Design a protein around this nucleic acid. Structure first.
Ligand SMILES: [Mg+2]
Ligand SMILES: [Mg+2]
Ligand SMILES: [Mg+2]
Ligand SMILES: [Mg+2]
Ligand SMILES: [Mg+2]
Ligand SMILES: [Mg+2]
Ligand SMILES: [Mg+2]
Ligand SMILES: [Mg+2]
Ligand SMILES: [Mg+2]
Ligand SMILES: [Mg+2]
Ligand SMILES: [Mg+2]
Ligand SMILES: [Mg+2]
Ligand SMILES: [Mg+2]
Ligand SMILES: [Mg+2]
Ligand SMILES: [Mg+2]
Ligand SMILES: [Mg+2]
Ligand SMILES: [Mg+2]
Ligand SMILES: [Mg+2]
Ligand SMILES: [Mg+2]
Ligand SMILES: [Mg+2]
Ligand SMILES: [Mg+2]
Ligand SMILES: [Mg+2]
Ligand SMILES: [Mg+2]
Ligand SMILES: [Mg+2]
Ligand SMILES: [Mg+2]
Ligand SMILES: [Mg+2]
Ligand SMILES: [Mg+2]
Ligand SMILES: [Mg+2]
Ligand SMILES: [Mg+2]
Ligand SMILES: [Mg+2]
Ligand SMILES: [Mg+2]
Ligand SMILES: [Mg+2]
Ligand SMILES: [Mg+2]
Ligand SMILES: [Mg+2]
Ligand SMILES: [Mg+2]
Ligand SMILES: [Mg+2]
Ligand SMILES: [Mg+2]
Ligand SMILES: [Mg+2]
Ligand SMILES: [Mg+2]
Ligand SMILES: [Mg+2]
Ligand SMILES: [Mg+2]
Ligand SMILES: [Mg+2]
Ligand SMILES: [Mg+2]
Ligand SMILES: [Mg+2]
Ligand SMILES: [Mg+2]
Ligand SMILES: [Mg+2]
Ligand SMILES: [Mg+2]
Ligand SMILES: [Mg+2]
Ligand SMILES: [Mg+2]
Ligand SMILES: [Mg+2]
Ligand SMILES: [Mg+2]
Ligand SMILES: [Mg+2]
Ligand SMILES: [Mg+2]
Ligand SMILES: [Mg+2]
Ligand SMILES: [Mg+2]
Ligand SMILES: [Mg+2]
Ligand SMILES: [Mg+2]
Ligand SMILES: [Mg+2]
Ligand SMILES: [Mg+2]
Ligand SMILES: [Mg+2]
Ligand SMILES: [Mg+2]
Ligand SMILES: [Mg+2]
Ligand SMILES: [Mg+2]
Ligand SMILES: [Mg+2]
Ligand SMILES: [Mg+2]
Ligand SMILES: [Mg+2]
Ligand SMILES: [Mg+2]
Ligand SMILES: [Mg+2]
Ligand SMILES: [Mg+2]
Ligand SMILES: [Mg+2]
Ligand SMILES: [Mg+2]
Ligand SMILES: [Mg+2]
Ligand SMILES: [Mg+2]
Ligand SMILES: [Mg+2]
Ligand SMILES: [Mg+2]
Ligand SMILES: [Mg+2]
Ligand SMILES: [Mg+2]
Ligand SMILES: [Mg+2]
Ligand SMILES: [Mg+2]
Ligand SMILES: [Mg+2]
Ligand SMILES: [Mg+2]
Ligand SMILES: [Mg+2]
Ligand SMILES: [Mg+2]
Ligand SMILES: [Mg+2]
Ligand SMILES: [Mg+2]
Ligand SMILES: [Mg+2]
Ligand SMILES: [Mg+2]
Ligand SMILES: [Mg+2]
Ligand SMILES: [Mg+2]
Ligand SMILES: [Mg+2]
Ligand SMILES: [Mg+2]
Ligand SMILES: [Mg+2]
Ligand SMILES: [Mg+2]
Ligand SMILES: [Mg+2]
Ligand SMILES: [Mg+2]
Ligand SMILES: [Mg+2]
Ligand SMILES: [Mg+2]
Ligand SMILES: [Mg+2]
Ligand SMILES: [Mg+2]
Lengths: 222, 159, 49, 148, 185, 127, 51, 58
RNA sequence: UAAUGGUUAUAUGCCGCCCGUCUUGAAACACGGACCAAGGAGUCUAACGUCUAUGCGAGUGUUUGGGUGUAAAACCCAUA
RNA sequence: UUUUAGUGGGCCAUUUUUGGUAAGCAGAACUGGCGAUGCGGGAUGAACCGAACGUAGAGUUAAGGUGCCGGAAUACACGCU
RNA sequence: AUGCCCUGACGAGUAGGCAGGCGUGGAGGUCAGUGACGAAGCCUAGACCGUAAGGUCGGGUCGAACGGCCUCUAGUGCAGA
């Protein structure tokens, strides 16, 4: 009476319940993303028609990549790179924008490329290079149940729940972002552009704020 | 040879702060210090008794002892690769209260007050401080504000 | 020399002490011979105790 | 145990664990207790404070049997009664038959009052006692007998 | 390359096995390894770690210390568990009814415990009659009462017992130890 | 034949010869690590010899296996040989060097009767 | 034992994200915007084309 | 012969190898340098409080 | 089966300065080294610190001696 | 928390400095390095740029390059000489 | 079950520390081990195993002893002086 035929079926029914919830969550998130972006486009249009200027809300998320190697770093940038968990070259981390962290990003400015990531790059980063931290031990995601086993207390059920909590900086961004292992990115597949990396992007190099060109960069590195 | 006396390199530290020489005002002597209060150290140059060493200028510590005219202050001092507790015997004209411990105590009282109005109704009032946030969406009008500015300026010497 | 927190020792070996080292390898042999002397003396001074 | 020593592990390595710079020498700080007041002063004061100088009055021809006075404490004191008799002597405690403990015959010279004999009367024969030893022995209902 | 924050390949710094080649203690470690893994009682993990410890990390527990622990409120009928030697104590004259599970008992300690009507138990019998450590009281002997710990941290103004072979007048009671000869300490 | 093992990869087939063993007769070819302060071999300058290090170690499935696929077992006699009876797909018998020829005949006969592969069935044979 | 990438491997892209079927069926990645005809103000075009 | 007198080079990296320690505060610090009259009265004020909480519970 | 592979010699391409040593710095126009064999350098002891292991444990230490013995072993033992 | 080795000759670079006409000079301050360290680049080189190293395979790069030696455009473009 | 298996991260190094191993003379035990039908030694751009210290085998030469494992012990490992 080991009840394999009914234990497997009850577990399958629970699996289908969870998948129904995940499906309706993702449909709600897709409608939310679409109405947010169309409302920003229409707000720009309506301000131009009124003669106003629509100023966008300032960006709340940057994606930081350490672009300089390990040797010859001064101790205060070295400490801040460890604190942002950028401990090797082409490491990446999502960063919530506050004053308390925009002054970290000014200290580590010659050693990192950052900017504002789009939904396409967050989606591709988390599907391809997304790893959790589970007793710590760097576990690949590849399953919604293992995401739910550590982030279900925060109401994060699936990988797209994780992506949504990253991109809309929710109340559990800190937990969802510290659960992700720092992204281990390759070199950019086309190159950096820029014959010399270690200038500012404004000055024709790589480091600093490259506000929305970080999407092109990280898609080449991913 | 070399010189490392008690008040060496104190030409400007113990100077008396232009047009504020002479007698010490009396609120300095009527402030009350309890054991555990957090005090700042700034030596008055005009009182030579109870005077802290020059290391302790700008240092902030805790009152552990209260005496006839003086308080004892715990100061943490970085000796080599660790911190040592130093006990200081400073008269109260070299001592002032920290304004940070005022500001934190009105934040404690504000936290208790808003937690009381959250207990009255409306729980989860979100009573931690937050860093400065990125600004939200504005609409900027062009009403008496048509954007009109010229270019960079030519070089002239004006000498 | 003097170095780390150790008790201060008083080992007296600044003479030629190796000229005067007695090791009692003959402990068992001198026991055999003392028992032999007791047996021989007993036989010499029969029945006296 | 010659094969367990690190001499067997320093074979092949030039300096035998002693360094190439400092380069193991004969007696680099002197022999013995040399320079305890000059170059070993910090190892004297810090880890042997009190080492130098004189302390009080000399005793010529001290015999350490004028000073044999081993100390017994009342917290033991019933170990001196053998274990077969200990049970019957502490059960149904009695004056007019109390155990006689010769402390000298067990090899102590003074009784001291560490604490809490039970309330059984005891006749304690001692060369010396302390005051509190006396007070607790008499509070049990016993007596100290002075012997020589 | 990686900017390592922690030291790499760092062992835990904890015994994960006894350093002794005692076959019976290895059998006890096998039993309590099994219990600590399959039971999820914290007692079994604590007993396994205490089974790993060294000799000075397992001080003896006296029977007077056992009896004083049994004079706690609600702890009269608890099984006293000592992971180590139980020694006798002649300074105590009343001994209560007890079950004591220990590695070793001295002859006097075994005699005193079973003469008071109690029982002396090994750790495997403790595991059989209490697999989860139910109704137990773990007792540890005084670690820093050792003679070596007197000399630990010797320095100025420490009061921490110089390492000295012979003791008396003429042995470190002079310059550095009183105001009259130089300075005190 | 032996068990199905993966293809044996040795990672460094070449002998680790000592530095300057080609140069001096008194320097034997047995591996010694350079302990010199200015040794280019110790400092791993390009163009110098490799040093034996743990990354060269064999995969544990194929380690100690011969090209036949058997672990070798040194055998002195029939009683030593018959401790390999149930292991003829993992173990091949090496006959020891100091076994006399007439005992080698006996060992080889027993190993043919038992199916034990013998790595040296040709020593001390009148051939 | 082997990390399979989604955005390759449609099977793993359906194991994660059950909305990946619905997104493709409604096509949702090439969908037409609403065709409005809102026109910017003359003050905007004057400022844009100003010197 | 003349040599290098003094430098503070490498000393902060050595001090941060074990990463400068805060002195591990406790509840109830010592009364080292606390006023002796306050200490004398504190002894009796705690004696009477030990007796007061003894009589409050028993 | 030397067809693939191993080993070896050679050719070719690129790379590769002589080890040991002191030194901030050695290929050095610094020092030892023509070559080979054999020998060749942290040992033993008295006292002792830390740690660990073992025995017993408010005790402990049989071996100075005595008894005994298949005899420098092993075994047993009193007072100190 | 205990215990113990080696070390107690340093040197170079950016920046701030002292003495000196100055020095690959002498002396300090902060950090990074060499010492103690190979690798790619600077022809060459202790320290410069890049990057720090288990053994391999594939891919992408850094710094530096792409007439030929030499892997890679005698590329494209605006001029100057 | 200092076994087997699963998961993750990591790997530069003088002076130095610690660990796990390899080898030599001799000792206790064992393999009722090897051997004049050939022990040991020695030679061998012949073979096999080990990351390595090393270990094993084949052929030649040789003529009396010598190995494995478990422990014990040290006058125990050489390119230099
Ligand atoms: Mg972060
Ligand atoms: Mg966190
Ligand atoms: Mg990376
Ligand atoms: Mg390409
Ligand atoms: Mg480039
Ligand atoms: Mg650059
Ligand atoms: Mg650069
Ligand atoms: Mg001065
Ligand atoms: Mg002055
Ligand atoms: Mg001022
Ligand atoms: Mg005065
Ligand atoms: Mg010291
Ligand atoms: Mg005898
Ligand atoms: Mg004799
Ligand atoms: Mg006689
Ligand atoms: Mg050993
Ligand atoms: Mg060497
Ligand atoms: Mg060696
Ligand atoms: Mg070394
Ligand atoms: Mg050493
Ligand atoms: Mg030397
Ligand atoms: Mg020295
Ligand atoms: Mg030395
Ligand atoms: Mg002098
Ligand atoms: Mg003296
Ligand atoms: Mg005197
Ligand atoms: Mg005198
Ligand atoms: Mg008294
Ligand atoms: Mg331990
Ligand atoms: Mg003691
Ligand atoms: Mg000690
Ligand atoms: Mg003595
Ligand atoms: Mg005295
Ligand atoms: Mg003296
Ligand atoms: Mg090989
Ligand atoms: Mg080799
Ligand atoms: Mg040689
Ligand atoms: Mg060699
Ligand atoms: Mg060496
Ligand atoms: Mg060299
Ligand atoms: Mg060399
Ligand atoms: Mg001179
Ligand atoms: Mg110097
Ligand atoms: Mg400096
Ligand atoms: Mg350091
Ligand atoms: Mg330090
Ligand atoms: Mg053929
Ligand atoms: Mg063939
Ligand atoms: Mg050639
Ligand atoms: Mg060639
Ligand atoms: Mg060639
Ligand atoms: Mg060539
Ligand atoms: Mg070429
Ligand atoms: Mg070349
Ligand atoms: Mg030399
Ligand atoms: Mg020189
Ligand atoms: Mg130089
Ligand atoms: Mg050299
Ligand atoms: Mg030259
Ligand atoms: Mg010369
Ligand atoms: Mg010389
Ligand atoms: Mg030579
Ligand atoms: Mg010469
Ligand atoms: Mg030789
Ligand atoms: Mg030799
Ligand atoms: Mg020599
Ligand atoms: Mg004795
Ligand atoms: Mg005996
Ligand atoms: Mg050490
Ligand atoms: Mg020097
Ligand atoms: Mg200079
Ligand atoms: Mg060097
Ligand atoms: Mg050096
Ligand atoms: Mg480098
Ligand atoms: Mg370059
Ligand atoms: Mg180059
Ligand atoms: Mg050049
Ligand atoms: Mg730079
Ligand atoms: Mg590298
Ligand atoms: Mg070409
Ligand atoms: Mg690595
Ligand atoms: Mg390493
Ligand atoms: Mg090994
Ligand atoms: Mg020998
Ligand atoms: Mg041998
Ligand atoms: Mg023998
Ligand atoms: Mg013959
Ligand atoms: Mg032979
Ligand atoms: Mg021979
Ligand atoms: Mg040859
Ligand atoms: Mg041959
Ligand atoms: Mg012959
Ligand atoms: Mg012969
Ligand atoms: Mg043989
Ligand atoms: Mg020898
Ligand atoms: Mg020798
Ligand atoms: Mg050598
Ligand atoms: Mg050498
Ligand atoms: Mg020679």
């Amino acid at each position: 009476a080991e009840q394999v035929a009914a234990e497997r079926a009850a577990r399958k029914a629970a699996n289908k319940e969870k998948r129904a919830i995940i499906l309706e969550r993702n449909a709600a998130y897709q409608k939310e993303y679409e109405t947010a972006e169309r409302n920003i486009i229409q707000a720009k249009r309506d301000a131009k028609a009124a003669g106003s200027y629509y100023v966008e809300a300032q960006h709340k998320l940057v994606f930081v990549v350490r672009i300089k190697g390990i040797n010859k770093i001064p101790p205060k940038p070295r400490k801040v790179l460890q604190l942002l968990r950028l401990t090797r070259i082409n490491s990446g981390t999502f960063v919530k924008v506050t004053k308390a962290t925009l002054e970290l990003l000014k200290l580590i400015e010659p050693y990192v490329a950052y900017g504002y990531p789009s939904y396409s790059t967050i989606r591709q980063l988390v599907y391809k290079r997304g790893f959790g931290k589970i007793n710590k031990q760097r576990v690949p995601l590849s399953d919604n149940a293992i995401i739910e086993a550590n982030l279900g207390k925060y109401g994060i059920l699936s990988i797209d729940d994780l992506i949504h909590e990253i991109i809309t900086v929710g109340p559990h961004f800190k937990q969802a972002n510290n659960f992700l292992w720092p992204f281990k990115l390759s070199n950019p597949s086309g190159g950096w552009g820029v014959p010399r990396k270690f200038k500012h992007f404004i000055q024709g190099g790589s480091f600093g704020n490259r506000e929305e060109f970080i999407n092109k960069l990280v898609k080449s590195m991913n | 040879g070399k010189s490392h006396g008690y008040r060496s390199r104190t030409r400007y530290m113990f100077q008396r702060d232009f047009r504020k020489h002479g007698a010490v005002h009396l609120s300095t002597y009527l402030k009350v210090y309890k054991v555990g209060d957090i005090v700042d150290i700034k030596a008055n140059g005009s009182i030579q008794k109870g005077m802290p060493h020059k290391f302790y200028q700008g240092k902030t510590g805790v009152v552990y002892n209260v005496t006839k005219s003086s308080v004892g202050v715990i100061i943490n001092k970085m000796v080599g690769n660790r911190y040592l507790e130093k006990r200081l015997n400073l008269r109260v004209e070299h001592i002032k209260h920290s304004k940070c411990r005022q500001e934190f105590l009105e934040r404690v009282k504000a936290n208790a007050a808003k937690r009381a109005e959250a207990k009255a109704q409306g729980v989860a009032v979100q009573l931690k401080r937050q860093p400065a946030q990125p600004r939200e969406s504005r609409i900027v009008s062009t009403e008496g504000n048509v954007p009109q500015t010229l270019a960079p300026v030519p070089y002239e010497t004006f000498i | 020399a003097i170095s780390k927190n150790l008790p201060i020792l008083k080992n007296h070996f600044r003479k030629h002490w190796q000229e005067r080292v007695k090791v009692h390898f003959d402990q068992a042999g001198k026991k055999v011979s003392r028992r032999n002397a007791r047996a021989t003396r007993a036989a010499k001074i029969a029945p006296r105790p | 145990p010659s094969r367990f020593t690190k001499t067997r592990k320093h074979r092949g390595h030039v300096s035998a664990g002693k360094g190439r710079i400092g380069k193991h020498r004969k007696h680099p700080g002197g022999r013995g207790m040399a320079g305890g007041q000059h170059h070993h002063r910090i190892n004297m004061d810090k880890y042997h404070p009190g080492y130098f100088g004189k302390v009080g009055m000399r005793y010529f021809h001290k015999q350490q049997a004028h000073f044999w006075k081993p100390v017994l404490n009342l917290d033991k004191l019933w170990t001196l009664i053998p274990e077969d008799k200990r049970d019957q002597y502490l059960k149904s405690a009695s004056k007019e038959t109390a155990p006689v403990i010769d402390t000298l015959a067990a090899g102590y010279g003074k009784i001291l009052g560490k604490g809490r004999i039970p309330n059984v009367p005891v006749i304690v024969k001692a060369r010396f006692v302390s005051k509190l030893a006396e007070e607790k022995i008499r509070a049990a209902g016993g007596v100290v007998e002075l012997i020589a | 390359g990686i900017d390592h924050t922690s030291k790499q390949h760092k062992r835990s710094g904890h015994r994960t096995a006894p350093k002794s080649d005692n076959v019976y203690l290895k059998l006890l470690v096998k039993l309590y390894t099994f219990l600590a893994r399959r039971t999820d009682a914290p007692f079994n993990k604590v007993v396994l770690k205490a089974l790993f410890l060294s000799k000075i990390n397992r001080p003896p527990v006296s029977v007077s210390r056992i009896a004083r622990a049994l004079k706690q409120e609600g702890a009269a009928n608890k099984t006293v568990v000592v992971v180590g030697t139980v020694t006798d104590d002649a300074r105590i004259f009343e001994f209560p009814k007890t079950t004591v599970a220990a590695l070793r008992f001295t002859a006097g300690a075994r005699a005193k415990i079973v003469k008071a009507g109690g029982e002396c138990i090994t750790l495997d019998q403790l595991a059989v009659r209490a697999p989860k450590g139910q109704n137990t009281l773990i007792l540890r002997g005084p670690r820093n009462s050792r003679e070596a710990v007197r000399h630990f941290g010797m320095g100025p103004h420490k009061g921490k017992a110089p390492r000295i072979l012979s003791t008396g007048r003429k042995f470190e009671r002079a310059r550095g130890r009183r105001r009259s000869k130089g300075f005190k300490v | 034949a032996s068990l199905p093992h993966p293809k044996i990869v040795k990672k460094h087939t070449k002998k680790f010869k000592r530095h300057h063993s080609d140069r001096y007769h008194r320097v034997a070819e047995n591996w010694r690590k350079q302990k010199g302060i200015d040794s280019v071999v110790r400092r791993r300058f390009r163009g110098n010899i490799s040093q034996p290090k743990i990354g060269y170690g064999s995969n544990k499935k194929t380690k100690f296996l011969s090209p036949s696929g058997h672990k070798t077992f040194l055998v002195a006699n029939v009683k030593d040989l018959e401790t390999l009876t149930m292991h003829t797909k993992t173990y091949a018998a090496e006959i020891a060097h100091n076994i006399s020829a007439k005992n080698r005949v006996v060992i080889l006969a027993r190993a043919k009767a038992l199916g034990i592969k013998v790595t040296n069935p040709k020593g001390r044979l009148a051939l | 034992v082997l990390k399979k990438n989604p955005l390759k491997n449609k099977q793993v892209l359906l194991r994660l994200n059950p909305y990946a079927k619905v997104f493709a069926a409604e096509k949702l990645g090439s969908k037409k915007a609403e065709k409005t005809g809102t026109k910017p103000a003359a003050v905007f075009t004057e400022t844009l084309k100003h010197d | 012969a003349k040599s290098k007198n003094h430098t503070a080079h490498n000393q902060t990296r050595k001090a941060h190898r074990n990463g400068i320690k805060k002195p591990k505060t406790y509840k109830y610090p010592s009364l080292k340098g606390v006023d002796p009259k306050f200490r004398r009265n504190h002894k009796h004020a705690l004696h009477g409080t030990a007796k007061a909480l003894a009589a409050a519970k028993k």
